[PDB]
Symmetry: D2
Subunit: 480 residues, 4 copies
């Protein structure tokens, strides 16, 4: 038994009635409990994420099966059996917070590893490639996919306009308009790092690395029709499914694999290994098992933990570094940037975002300083040996630069169509029918010029792909 109180810790005598002029009269300004309670209620909401607003979170554990010290000095990967706590958020992409989980979209797959050398965030998606290869385009791509800024409804004519004029999107669309565009839920879903990263070992040797998460529950997708049937009855079915699995002890898991590639393979390839519109062949760069992540604990409060969770591809740990991927390079900025706005300058003190490893630096102040700071010395260098100092054992590598000028220029060997064709041809007949069906439903109402350009991009990927789509849409492409 407990008293209801104000935020001043005064017990509340009456949580039912406002203070008024007799039992029916107007209300008095001197009602601190009323005003305090309504003023806080009036301030509950913070801005949603600019993308991936709809999502759900869980905690778990990552365990190393095969130590990776030959290839990376990352502490959390250094010994067989080594266990690291994680927090994970899954998400959709485009629509706002309360939107259905049955819509077509990539799904977010964001893993925060609380390591002994700091927090490591691997901010992935289910699908292993992306629509674009330069961050400068991301607001455009997003604006095109987001609800129309006049009508508040998503319009295929808008995002197809952008995508068709951005033919590097052709590989991604070939995956997204398979039925994997609507995963059955967050458990029965692939995960991918997408980008090439650099792994650096204790000798300073570097490899390119790709990450892949393979669901213990298998991959399962929804057709458009199966999605509609779910949507009719539940607009948060994946959020429900994840919570429910974990509450009943049926913990979902994923095995982590990597691919590794020498830096010197750049010239051996007909695409850029750091173009995030490209996968690497599993035949040429085989998947190597690392370990397993199991999610086994729901959050205690959705807002405090899942809503306020902050992930960044720039939360890298010794041994793991960015590649030159221009898309990744902009993400390194944009995540902490948006989080300072969304969550406050001190968002890194919110519990879910706090490292397990110690934090000591000379940053200070900012909105909502809750950490009881102390001491006179908030600058370095200083004369005091006991104050925090830089540690040269933790310097990052020094990547070689091949360019001799500061330029704005597309990568060489963009190769926009070849992998899309390879993917298309890798589909079963049943999967090819689904892809054509889904693309046809999306493209049938768009501007004719845009519709033709889409067909041409897919035709350049594979002639059969393009021809089938043309026939399904009633578009005669004989004169080309």
């Amino acid at each position: 038994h407990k008293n209801l109180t104000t935020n001043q810790g005064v017990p509340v005598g009456d949580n039912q009635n406002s203070r008024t002029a007799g039992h029916r009269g107007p209300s008095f300004l001197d009602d601190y409990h009323l005003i305090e309670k309504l003023a806080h209620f009036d301030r509950e909401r913070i801005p949603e994420r600019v993308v991936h607003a709809r999502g759900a979170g869980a905690y778990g554990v990552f365990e190393v099966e095969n130590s990776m010290e030959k290839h990376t000095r990352a502490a959390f990967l250094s010994e067989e059996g080594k266990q690291t706590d994680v927090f994970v958020r899954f998400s959709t992409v485009i629509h706002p917070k309360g939107s259905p989980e049955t819509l077509r979209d990539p799904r977010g797959f964001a893993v925060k590893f609380y390591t002994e050398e700091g927090n490591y965030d691997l901010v992935g998606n289910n699908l292993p490639i992306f629509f674009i290869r330069d961050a400068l385009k991301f607001p455009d791509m997003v604006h095109s996919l987001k609800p129309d800024p006049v009508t508040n409804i998503q319009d295929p004519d808008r995002y197809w306009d952008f995508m068709t004029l951005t033919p590097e999107s052709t590989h991604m669309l070939t995956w997204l308009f398979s039925d994997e565009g609507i995963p059955a839920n967050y458990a029965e879903m692939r995960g991918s790092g997408v980008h090439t990263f650099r792994w650096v070992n204790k000798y300073g040797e570097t490899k390119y690395v790709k990450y892949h998460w393979r669901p213990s529950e298998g991959i399962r997708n929804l057709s458009m029709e199966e999605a509609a049937e779910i949507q009719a009855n539940d607009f948060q079915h994946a959020t429900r499914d994840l919570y429910d699995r974990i509450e009943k002890g049926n913990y979902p898991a994923w095995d982590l694999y990597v691919q590794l590639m020498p830096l010197s393979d750049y010239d051996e390839l007909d695409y850029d290994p750091c173009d995030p519109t490209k996968t690497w062949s599993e035949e040429d760069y085989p998947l190597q098992k690392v370990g397993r992540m199991t999610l086994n604990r729901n959050p205690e409060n959705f807002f405090a933990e899942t809503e306020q969770a902050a992930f960044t591809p720039s939360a890298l740990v010794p041994g793991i570094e960015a590649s030159e991927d221009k898309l990744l390079q902009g993400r390194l900025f944009s995540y902490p940037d948006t989080q300072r706005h969304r969550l406050g300058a001190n968002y890194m003190r919110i519990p879910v975002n706090c490292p397990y490893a110690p934090v000591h630096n000379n940053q200070q102040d900012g909105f909502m300083t809750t950490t009881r700071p102390s001491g006179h010395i908030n600058y370095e260098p200083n004369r005091y040996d006991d104050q925090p100092k830089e540690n040269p054992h933790y310097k990052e590598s020094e990547p070689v630069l091949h360019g001799d000028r500061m330029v704005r220029q597309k990568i060489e060997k963009p190769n926009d169509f070849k992998q899309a064709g390879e993917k298309y041809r890798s589909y079963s007949e049943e999967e090819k029918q689904a892809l054509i069906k889904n693309l046809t439903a999306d493209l049938k109402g768009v501007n004719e010029k845009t519709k033709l350009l889409a067909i041409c991009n897919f035709y350049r990927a594979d002639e059969d792909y393009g021809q089938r789509l043309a026939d399904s849409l009633g578009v005669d492409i004989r004169s080309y």
Copy 2:
């Protein structure tokens, strides 16, 4: 033909490629366009409304059919034929932005009238009563209805716990669990002021008033099955319908009616006429036609106009005043309070929120001061005859207080069950079946003790109502 520019007005030479060390190298910090563009993208989102987050807006005109000058000095209602521009937002209540418009909920019906004596907001709902009668309870009610703070899913066990222990909710629930709980769209929908207000005429005489909006399009509601079928195909059908009707010239309209009641009628009624859980009998207080509102223009930008729209029940004009309704009283505070948070201190300068009537006062500064202020004199009284002065012609009335003391005390004559029973008995047999069906599907999984308490509250409203609900739920209530 136009240049893309930065926010500094410098034309952009390349909107495709980040600035990099050669064609494929890492990105440079000196890329003002990349950073400016991403940093603004990163800051697009503001907090959604704490309730009524999902909604849609339109502009139009209100035209007076019958002058109301016998009863109110309100300027916009003074003359036959007098036209006042309006902005209107419609909304659901509980779920976030992006949520479906096929869910059970009251619907918001918020009208801003841009009058010659200032902006007048009538911030209504479709349904004419409310669940509670004191604002101190509003955060509780909302929290009970909102998705569970652990699971992020709405849970009937939670809101039925609250409602059943708040039996003044019984009349509201008797309307909301009719099929009017799911309006077909925003056009084919009732509107209501809900509260009693005070109308004050040129002689200073006051009457109680209620407001009603009657759709020219008639009322159409969705059964739970029809709502499911629409939810499957379109999560935003009401937003779509409203835009589309207006774009095709099929402008929706509502007639405005009032009921009027003498102050003195308090003492003779068996309920409090300022209890917003009560309606007034249309036999005893007949609807009187005032005018018609037609919505004929979509906004140019959904975020700037509909998202940023701010309404408050405290935006009253001369001739129209609050009543003593303890629910209304809290609303006077909470709306501009929340809006200062949600939108900024200067939210009243956002174009949709601006009055047509001139604004002159000694307020200053605050975030995002865009108005080019000038002058030395920002205080009153002052010696300058040309500076803004108070104007005694515009004083509000001086309501009589019946209370002796500052108290926290429930109103007399709460009468929580009688009108709910009257409503129930007014339903056709088909409508009583729908009610019971919709209640049954909501209650069937709730805690048994809460379930029984719901049944008892409805049984107190009407025996046949309560017994049918009990029969439908398999609950034997004969021992009580």
Copy 3:
């Protein structure tokens, strides 16, 4: 010995050099330590207080000498010897954060008591009366005093315009333009509650109360010339003095006294006992000793504790209530209102602001939620006996209301001039000379019509007062 780290807990390898293209080239975007460190730096500052921006804080202890249980049920005053921790901030009023502490102004004297029944804030000044008696005028008065909104310099012509047209200010100015307008430092300074409050005992009996703090260090004031001489070498002398006293173990202290007055004395007086322009005679309502406050500890971090400290007159505890003073009534609203803006919705979780008493309520979320919330139940009423409930033993009193209407109307018996005259006559000859000198230097450059109105207000207080000021200003008032 400690590593410098990022906020992710990654040790920093180099805290000297940015990451660049070779040793002399431009900087890279992928420098997380640079960006994180600059971005936090860029966000250190929050808005200063709207008034009393310049100030200094200290902790200490309040110890009861004479229990007050006969007059108030306040827990912290219930027993001889009972000790309550305090946090105190002292301040100037008008100028910004870095402004000199040698300027004429009231001084703030804000005491937060961490009691067993919640935090109690007594938000006083040194001077025992105020310029104005209604909170509607506060923004006006402030705007007049503040630096001119064009020039950013304070202008006597502006605030004298306001003050002269607000003659209830005449008592306050008669104190403020004595040399007590510039206290020597914060230790050698009086403290006052200013307002009448209500004390309520365990029988529900109410008295009016005034609070007074008497410095153990005695009162010392600066002449204008002494203030200039300090200002020449130190613009933060009072902040220095306070820190330095406490660091040397020379702890300043104040004894707390109250005056007590029956509610029924209203009719015995020629002023309103709740008019904050008025003092109560010490002959007729003698000072009664309560206890002593000693300040004995400097804060650990000036931003986290002193800058982010939030006090509100509405932080009242059982046994202590507001009076009907219209000036106080507005303050009840304005402090927590400004603090939500200045500090965040969750400002009451900031350590200095936290109560020692337990906090349990159904409030939730808001920016920077750091408190690890949990549980499914965030609403009341609820069916769970272990969740927080209202406690009727802690209801506030029910003050009698004498008015029968909602009005906007000045108090009866404003009596604007009598106490100013009494104060003037109470001054020693030396003190009267300083008053006239100080007023003369302030008035000599103002508008002649305003100047004359000031002289007339002071003449109405006391003929000699007014005549001396007139002579000193070269104004001939023969003919009035």
Copy 4:
């Protein structure tokens, strides 16, 4: 004659009295005017600048005397006689708003040129060099200078600890501790761009450039004693002086000169020409006159225009580019970053910040959207020829990179002491005495080890400089 109104445009009947229970009773919640007026007052303040918080602004005109088209394509410099509007803000550095203008500090000299190709900000100081050469150190330097985080008083022992351990500061301190460390006012003051920039002409040819502003009023400084005498009577004398000059028609002016240096001169200088701790010889790189800036208009509102002014070194225009200077490189980021926090995401729409040149882009939304956006197309590429497109005539240059790796490494040829010695020897005997006097007063209380290190740095600049300082401080330097 004008009515006082609410923000809703309703005329105010009484701007004196709150609404209350009779003439002396407590206040009612239904007082929209009171709560609106107090709530806006409660939100007047925004965060001050993190540095340069104290300052003053004015408008004027820049007129070209010698067209610079041989060296830069900058539009505003292209023709003799061409006039460009400016806004200028002058400032101190370390102390807050409200601090005196008689303190030692660099002075800010920030110039916004409203050019036909966009806004160009030259964000200078009076002194032509800086304490540090890498932006990574800036928060450390600032934190050491700023008031101690515990005491709120600036402590020489703190900043001398930093500066001594940062010996690249030696040249700066040699200027700052001359009497030019306290300019007499803002008009009688030098201006400097500080950094090397790059100028690029219409043929694509690049030169290094430095900017210098020479006051038509001459340079005049204050001794410590002359500063104290002013500080005694006016803590805003420079703000006053500026306003008063312009109001009286006595417009202050500065001639703009540049120094120009071939890129290839790097290799034969004994310093790095992009090290902002270094000046360029005026014998070897003579000052070349460009034009004249006259300040002739005070702002209409200090908050809206001077407080909310936003400058950034990254507001460059075609023809003017950053150099590789590692200090400048971080400024390019930090200014718009802090401004998004300080002012809002849409700070560039605040009138003083708006370009004269057209702004057209696909950015949208964000807090306080006041610009009436319209249109369906917010993404590029798109199919619409009339939507904003990139324009390749406005690409920036492609600087050659000399580095072959991503490194964190100090520049070659730091040469920390040579120019400090040259400056010392360039002082008159009178100026050397002032320098030693000013340094001695600053150093006399600092830690002995730090004090010695300071003496040693200045001794390395010039043996006489160091010996005199040692003698003045009573430090025996023999055993070194």
